[PDB]
Write an enzyme that holds these catalytic residues in place. Structure first.
Site, short mmCIF file in Angstrom:
data_model
loop_
_atom_site.label_atom_id
_atom_site.label_comp_id
_atom_site.label_asym_id
_atom_site.label_seq_id
_atom_site.Cartn_x
_atom_site.Cartn_y
_atom_site.Cartn_z
N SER A 47 0.80 -1.22 0.00
CA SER A 47 0.00 0.00 0.00
C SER A 47 0.84 1.27 0.00
O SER A 47 0.27 2.36 -0.16
CB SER A 47 -0.96 0.00 1.20
N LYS A 50 0.35 3.39 -3.04
CA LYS A 50 -0.75 4.33 -3.17
C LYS A 50 -0.24 5.76 -3.36
O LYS A 50 -0.96 6.61 -3.87
CB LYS A 50 -1.68 4.24 -1.95
N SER A 95 -6.17 2.91 3.53
CA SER A 95 -5.53 2.01 2.56
C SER A 95 -6.56 1.17 1.82
O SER A 95 -6.51 -0.06 1.82
CB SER A 95 -4.49 1.12 3.24
N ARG A 227 4.99 -0.61 13.34
CA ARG A 227 5.60 0.15 12.26
C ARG A 227 5.81 1.60 12.67
O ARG A 227 6.91 2.15 12.54
CB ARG A 227 4.72 0.07 11.01
O1 LIG Z 1 -1.56 -1.16 6.99
C1 LIG Z 1 -2.59 -1.13 7.71
O2 LIG Z 1 -2.64 -0.66 8.87
C2 LIG Z 1 -3.86 -1.71 7.13
C3 LIG Z 1 -4.94 -0.89 6.84
C4 LIG Z 1 -6.10 -1.42 6.32
C5 LIG Z 1 -6.20 -2.78 6.09
C6 LIG Z 1 -5.13 -3.64 6.38
C7 LIG Z 1 -5.25 -5.10 6.19
C8 LIG Z 1 -5.13 -5.98 7.27
C9 LIG Z 1 -5.33 -7.34 7.10
C10 LIG Z 1 -5.65 -7.84 5.85
C11 LIG Z 1 -5.77 -7.00 4.76
C12 LIG Z 1 -6.18 -7.53 3.41
O3 LIG Z 1 -7.58 -7.47 3.20
C13 LIG Z 1 -5.56 -5.64 4.94
C14 LIG Z 1 -3.96 -3.08 6.89
#
Ligand SMILES: O=C(O)c1cccc(-c2cccc(CO)c2)c1
Ligand SMILES: [Cl-]
Length: 242
Positions: A47, A50, A95, A227
């Site tokens: 992500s 993005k 995201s 993170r």
């Molecule tokens: O980076 C994050 O903080 C974040 C933000 C939104 C969604 C996710 C995420 C977590 C688990 C699985 C999936 C796949 O669908 C996505 C992570």
């Protein structure tokens, strides 16, 4: 001029993890990292892609502005915040992959590939599905390569309009107080080993800017909060933030 500070490894090992933080002092043009090797190892951007995806979508008119509403397609997904309408700001904040997948489809292979080359972004390789290559395709980018790309964005030196760059930097806004501003983007890569989390961006001070790019092993989603926490501990240790 690059400097390796292995003392930062404590911030990762103390949390039973492994990773790299890369810092760049813009005023002094000096870089710092706990692990020179991993700083130059290339991972899926996930992500964090993005950022470039937003730039390209705006500059080509795929996205009109940061207010344009991208309606939920009505398909229930496992992330509740995705099951709603979004604009560029909220899509970045949460995201929202499916919004950015549609961006990529409208951008198309040819224009996406050209723009990533113009950006000098990572390995510039979009091999795979146009709507998921940043999650499970051939594109790769290192932490040091993230810094190089982010510095260009900060200075409006990328080969898109100033407006596109201003809009994306607005959308990257994550934290602001009387001491600093953080503009950044998180990433979470699970489809290709090793599973990692990203946090890339910069810290704006009154008199300087500190660019940062970190990734860390992420075997489960339980550690995603690390993170930002690890990054901020490094920033606090280096007296960049209070
Ligand atoms: O980076 C994050 O903080 C974040 C933000 C939104 C969604 C996710 C995420 C977590 C688990 C699985 C999936 C796949 O669908 C996505 C992570
Ligand atoms: Cl802003």
């Amino acid at each position: 001029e690059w400097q390796e500070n292995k003392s930062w490894n404590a911030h990762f090992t103390e949390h039973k993890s492994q990773g790299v933080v890369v810092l760049w002092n813009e005023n002094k043009q000096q870089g710092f990292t706990n692990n020179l090797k991993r700083a130059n190892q290339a991972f899926l951007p996930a992500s964090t892609f993005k950022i470039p995806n937003s730039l390209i979508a705006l500059d080509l008119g795929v996205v009109k502005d940061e207010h344009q509403v991208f309606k939920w397609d009505g398909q229930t997904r496992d992330i509740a915040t995705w099951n709603r309408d979004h604009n560029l700001i909220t899509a970045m904040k949460y995201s929202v992959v499916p919004v950015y997948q549609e961006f990529a489809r409208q951008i198309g292979e040819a224009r996406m590939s050209k723009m990533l080359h113009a950006f000098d972004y990572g390995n510039e390789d979009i091999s795979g599905n146009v709507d998921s290559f940043w999650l499970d395709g051939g594109i790769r980018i290192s932490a040091t390569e993230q810094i190089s790309f982010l510095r260009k964005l900060y200075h409006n030196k990328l080969h898109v309009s100033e407006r596109s760059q201003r809009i994306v930097k607005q959308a990257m806004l994550t934290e602001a107080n009387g001491d600093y501003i953080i503009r950044a983007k998180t990433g979470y890569s699970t489809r290709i080993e090793p599973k990692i989390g990203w946090w890339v961006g910069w810290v704006e001070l009154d008199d300087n800017v500190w660019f940062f790019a970190m990734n860390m092993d992420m075997p489960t989603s339980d550690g995603l909060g690390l993170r930002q926490a690890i990054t901020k501990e490094v920033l606090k240790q280096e007296k960049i933030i209070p």
